[PDB]
Amino acid sequence: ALADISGYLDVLDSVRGFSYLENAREVLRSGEARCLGNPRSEPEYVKALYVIGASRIPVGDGCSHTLEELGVFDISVPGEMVFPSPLDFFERGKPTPLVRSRLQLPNGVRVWLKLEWYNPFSLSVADRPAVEIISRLSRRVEKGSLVADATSSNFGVALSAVARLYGYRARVYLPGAAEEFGKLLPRLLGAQVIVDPEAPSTVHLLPRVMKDSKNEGFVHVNQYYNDANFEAHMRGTAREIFVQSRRGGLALRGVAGSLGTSGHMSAAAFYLQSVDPSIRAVLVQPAQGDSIPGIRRVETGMLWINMLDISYTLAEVTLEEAMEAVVEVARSDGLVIGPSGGAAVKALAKKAAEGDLEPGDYVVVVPDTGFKYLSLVQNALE
Ligand SMILES: Cc1ncc(COP(=O)(O)O)c(/C=N/[C@@H](COP(=O)(O)O)C(=O)O)c1O
């Protein structure tokens, strides 16, 4: 019989490396987890279960339990949408909406958009890694210390709100070309903001962040390499697409999305593909020469999408093409999705047009809201 996982989460602080995901994939493939003779002597297996989304764990002799029995499918949300705190709302106010699009794509590819602007701090996907990283920091690092990172915009905004709800000071480093909401809103949120107008990308800032961290002794949370990014997406974003697709009665044939740290799509793909390895992952390549906010080309360096055993496909997409998918989704659905969203929609549309895709439902992860990108919106129209 079962035990609340929340008493066992010291395994987050102690387990290392990716060998535990084997456990994660077999539990997802089989549909069950075998009973832990000693729960504390299998800290890997407990971490596989956290990661996939269990609220409970099987303890003692023999009895294997299903995914449902472990809490993967438990409803977190209160019917009435009342929450005692903004962090309780982040955590229990899930899943984000999965919304079937009116947008018509060729060869029977049915589009569902998963709306990641429904996260309360940055109105973006990047609330999830920021809550998980700052949560895990909270055991080891003293309140009032400074946490910092490089961002395209969204993670710093999230990092800033979250560090503050956990009693930490925050500093965010942006490239000059970053959107204005990423430069301004950390400050509103009580953080320090450094902008480098020469730094042509956001990863080019990391050597400075790392140098500064050495001198000034702040905590570089480094979303690019920190496994609590991938983990936050595994138990939120990915588990959600699984549970929603099942519970929605979807013929889930694939996922489409976009790549910054690679956290969210790495998890989406790895998770779902543990369940059914034929589920496709369609991934945006920002066409060379172009900048699509928040995202980049794979070969500029992304951890999880290269180290984990994930099957994916790329589809190159230009800024112009992305903003064109933003316009189309707006006129089809009345939903105003941001640039990286419309790149993912487009990449899905490119592959369906090629006849590569098995007819059925595909879930596009929409990282944020287009209200944050008016300049780009205005250029797309003129
Ligand atoms: C609008 C938007 N779309 C997609 C992504 C990609 O999510 P990830 O791959 O899980 O980081 C992000 C992630 N942004 C992160 C990472 O940015 P970066 O990898 O430097 O281009 C940030 O805000 O610093 C985003 O802001």
Swiss-Prot record:
List the thermal properties of the activity: Optimum temperature is above 90 degrees Celsius for S-sulfo-L-cysteine synthase activity, 70-80 degrees Celsius for O-acetylserine sulfhydrylase A activity, and 80 degrees Celsius for both cystathionine beta-synthase and L-serine sulfhdrylase activities.
Which superkingdom, per the lineage? Archaea
> What does the free-text pH dependence field read?
Optimum pH is 6.7 for O-acetylserine sulfhydrylase A activity and 8.1-8.8 for cystathionine beta-synthase activity.
Give the catalytic activity. Answer: O-acetyl-L-serine + hydrogen sulfide = L-cysteine + acetate; O-phospho-L-serine + hydrogen sulfide + H(+) = L-cysteine + phosphate; L-homocysteine + L-serine = L,L-cystathionine + H2O
Q: Which cofactor does it need?
A: pyridoxal 5'-phosphate
Keywords, A to Z, come to: Amino-acid biosynthesis, Cysteine biosynthesis, Lyase, Pyridoxal phosphate, Transferase
List, in alphabetical order, the Gene Ontology terms for molecular function in this entry. cystathionine beta-synthase activity; cysteine synthase activity; O-phosphoserine sulfhydrylase activity
- Per the UniProt entry, the Enzyme Commission number(s) are 4.2.1.22, 2.5.1.47, 2.5.1.65
Question: Per the UniProt entry, what is one GO biological process?
Answer: cysteine biosynthetic process from serine
Assembly with partners or alone? Homodimer.
Function as written in the Swiss-Prot or TrEMBL entry: Cysteine synthase that can also catalyze the synthesis of S-sulfo-L-cysteine from thiosulfate and O(3)-acetyl-L-serine, as well as the sulfhydrylation of L-serine by sulfide.
Name the protein family: Belongs to the cysteine synthase/cystathionine beta-synthase family.
What's this protein's name? Protein CysO
Q: Which organism is it from?
A: Aeropyrum pernix (strain ATCC 700893 / DSM 11879 / JCM 9820 / NBRC 100138 / K1)
